[PDB]
Structures are given as structure tokens and as C-alpha cells.
Design a protein around this ligand. Structure first.
Ligand SMILES: Cc1cc2nc3c(=O)[nH]c(=O)nc-3n(C[C@H](O)[C@@H](O)[C@@H](O)COP(=O)(O)OP(=O)(O)OC[C@H]3O[C@@H](n4cnc5c(N)ncnc54)[C@H](O)[C@@H]3O)c2cc1C
Ligand SMILES: *[C@H]1CC(=O)N(CC)C1=O
Length: 356
């Protein structure tokens, strides 16, 4: 139903949002090169690759190991500057008067160029990918009795499903032609993973709205976090420009059941998203990267929607101001993946059409 509204909203914003995301302020993400998979899991390529291609047939430089690796030359040393670790509060000086101070405990953290490391088909899959998605869905268990118990599990599942579908949609749009050696849409794959499962398409639009509602809820309390940055002076404005075009009646609906969830159920829900931790179990480097960015994006969104819910102007202003640049980056980059996933659906529907 409301599908059309989000599509309208998304088309009016696709360009501005893509430009914003390529800015120096949003183009980099802090990622710990060392990973601690503490939840364990199949490790051999024999069970980590997708059957979609007959790999033994393709050239070496087209194997999942290369398709999913970073573009070496695309990651500067991090924590050499604590900019990403600072609060929006403290990016610019509001009046004449942090990676350690704010908890970024990364062994060997680095800044990866997301513009040079887009999410796309990598060939990752098999039992491993299956074991991971499986564990996330199976970790949808809250404290029984608690008010809004059911609702909490429905939202958790839906968010994960939309995240899952968004990736599937993505690897489908940006698929590799093992003959032309060109990246191009793969309608058949889209149809097999997302196309023929309405609920999965719905969940992406669910995630799209959840994240868009968060950006819209913080807009009024955003600190003037960029006027001082000589390079990124306009970023804050350019973000307001996007967020402002996001207003929709859909935001009236309590998407994450904030007004129906126990105050402890809300923390459990926040704790489940942990989902960000399993991401370190993802052996495909680019998948880990974007997985981590999106899970952090959702966890950020949940925090915003849950906390700002109880309101209190002083508090609201604090909640958004004490949000870290790292979180805002994750949040807006997650919105960027959703925006593109929604666009890709419309493309595939029109592609599925010309097929006749
Ligand atoms: C966090 C993470 C990030 C990843 N990132 C990338 C990436 O950038 N690029 C790339 O090539 N691959 C990526 N993958 C791999 C991808 O998600 C694969 O598992 C896939 O292409 C191989 O798909 P599959 O058919 O074996 O199953 P999937 O399609 O993962 O199958 C899992 C199962 O869950 C169900 N399922 C599928 N979609 C949904 C849904 N939306 N909601 C509820 N259930 C669903 C299916 O019925 C099936 O039983 C990632 C994996 C993980 C765990
Ligand atoms: C979480 C709670 C529970 O009992 N299960 C089944 C093993 C879960 O997935």
C-alpha cells in the first residue's frame, strides 16, 4: 500500500543521498581488521561459497576470495584522529570553554573507503553464510511474560529479514556476468531470492521506514556538527535537505512498538542487535564490512527510536548530541543501502516486465 509513498520519497532523494554519501564525512568507515568470532562454523571455501556459479570453471581473479576482498589501496590508518569517535556534540565549538573516551576498542582499526568498496555480489554463501543468518534469526528470544513480548520478536525478525533481503537484492542488482566480465542486474536471481517472496520485499520497505523515521526524529536536535570542518562545511545542511524530504504519514505508526514495549524489553531488543558481533564471523571481507555497517545502522536506529520516544526536550537534545560520528555514518549508510534496494526493486519490476 504505502509502498508508493516511500518510492516517491525515495526517488525525490536518490541523487542528494548518493552525493551526501560520497562526501569525505560519510565515505569512510572505521573497521577493526582483527575479528573475534566468539560464537563458534564451516570455514572451508567448499562450504562458504554460493553454488550460483561453477567456480572451478572461472579464472582465478573471479573466485569468491577476490570478488569479496577489499581494494587494498583503499584504507588509511585510523585512530590517528579520533574524529569518528567523537560526539556530534564536540565536532564544532559551540562556545569558548576520544576513541578511548568513547569505547572504540579496536585492535587494528582502519578507515575503509566505502566508495571504492561497494556492497555487491561476492560469491559468498554456502553453509557458513547459512549458519550465520540462521543464528541471527534463532537469537530472536526475549524474556517471557514481559509486556510486548510477541511484538518485540516480530519487529526483531522483520528488521533482520529486511536487512537480509536488502543484501540479497543488492548482490542481484550488482551481479557479475561470468562471460562479459561485466557487472549487471540479474533478474532471475532477484526473483529467486526476493522477487517471489512478497514478505521479503515488504520487510525492506519496513526497514526503509524505520531508518527514515529515525533520521527524521533526530533532525530537530542535530548539533551544528560541520560548519567548522573546512572540507565538510555543507554536509549538515545537505543532510537536513534529505531528511526534510522524508516526511510521511507512515511515521505516525509505531513501527518498532516504542509505545508498547517494556522498558527492559527495549534494552533486550537493543542487546540482541550482538548481531553486530556475529558479523566478525563473516569470512567474506566486504560482506563483513557492509554487514557491520548495517547492523550498527539498525542498532543506532533502534536506540534513537526507543530513547527519543520517552521524550523530554533536554534529554532528546542530549541523546542526539551524544551520538557519535561513527553512529551517524552507519545510520546514513544503512539508509543508503535501503534507498538503493528500494530503487532496485522498481528496476527489477520494470525489467521483469520488458521480459514480455
Ligand atoms: C551478514 C551477512 C552479509 C552478507 N553480505 C553479502 C554481500 O555483500 N554480497 C554477496 O555476494 N553476499 C553476501 N552475503 C551472502 C548472502 O546473504 C548469502 O547467504 C547468499 O547469496 C547465498 O544465498 P543462499 O541462497 O544460499 O541463501 P539465503 O538466501 O541467505 O538463505 C538463508 C535462508 O533464509 C531464508 N531467507 C533468504 N532471504 C530471507 C529473508 N529476506 N527473510 C527471511 N528469510 C530469508 C531462505 O529461505 C533460506 O532458507 C552475506 C551473508 C551474511 C551472513
Ligand atoms: C531462543 C530461545 C529458545 O529456547 N530457542 C530455541 C532453541 C531460541 O531460539
Amino acid at each position: 500500500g504505502s509502498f508508493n509513498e516511500l518510492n516517491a520519497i525515495n526517488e525525490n532523494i536518490r541523487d542528494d543521498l548518493s552525493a551526501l554519501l560520497k562526501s569525505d564525512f560519510f565515505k569512510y568507515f572505521r573497521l577493526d581488521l582483527y575479528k573475534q568470532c566468539s560464537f563458534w562454523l564451516c570455514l572451508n571455501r567448499a562450504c562458504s561459497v554460493d553454488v550460483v556459479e561453477d567456480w572451478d570453471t572461472l579464472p582465478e581473479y573471479w573466485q569468491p576470495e577476490i570478488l569479496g576482498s577489499f581494494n587494498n589501496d583503499t584504507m588509511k590508518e585510523a585512530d590517528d584522529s579520533d574524529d569518528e569517535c567523537k560526539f556530534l556534540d564536540q565536532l564544532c565549538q559551540t562556545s569558548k570553554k576520544y576513541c578511548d573516551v568513547n569505547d572504540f576498542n579496536g585492535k587494528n582499526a582502519v578507515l575503509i573507503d566505502l566508495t571504492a568498496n561497494p556492497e555487491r555480489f561476492t560469491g559468498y554463501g554456502g553453509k557458513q553464510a547459512g549458519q550465520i543468518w540462521s543464528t541471527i534469526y534463532q537469537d530472536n528470544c526475549f524474556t517471557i511474560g514481559e509486556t510486548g513480548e510477541s511484538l518485540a520478536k516480530d519487529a526483531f525478525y522483520r528488521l533482520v529479514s529486511g536487512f537480509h533481503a536488502s543484501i540479497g537484492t543488492h548482490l542481484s542488482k550488482e551481479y557479475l556476468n561470468t562471460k562479459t566480465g561485466k557487472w549487471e542486474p540479474n533478474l532471475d536471481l532477484f526473483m529467486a531470492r526476493i522477487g517471489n517472496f512478497p514478505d521479503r520485499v515488504t520487510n525492506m520497505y519496513f526497514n526503509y521506514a524505520v531508518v527514515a523515521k529515525a533520521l527524521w526524529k533526530i533532525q530537530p536536535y542535530l548539533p551544528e556538527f560541520s560548519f567548522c570542518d573546512l572540507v565538510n562545511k555543507e554536509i549538515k545542511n545537505k543532510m537536513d535537505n534529505v531528511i526534510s524530504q522524508l516526511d510521511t504519514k507512515i511515521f505516525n505508526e509505531d513501527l518498532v512498538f516504542a509505545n508498547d514495549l517494556s522498558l527492559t524489553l527495549k534494552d533486550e531488543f537493543r542487546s540482541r542487535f550482538n548481531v553486530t558481533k556475529i558479523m566478525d564471523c563473516v569470512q567474506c571481507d566486504r560482506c563483513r564490512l557492509w554487514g557491520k555497517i548495517q547492523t550498527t545502522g539498525y542498532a543506532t536506529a533502534l536506540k534513537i527510536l526507543f530513547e527519543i520516544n520517552d521524550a523530554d526536550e533536554f534529554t532528546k537534545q542530549h541523546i542526539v548530541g551524544k551520538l557519535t560520528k561513527y553512529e551517524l555514518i552507519a545510520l546514513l549508510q544503512t539508509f543508503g543501502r535501503l534507498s538503493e534496494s528500494i530503487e532496485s526493486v522498481n528496476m527489477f519490476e520494470k525489467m521483469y516486465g520488458k521480459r514480455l
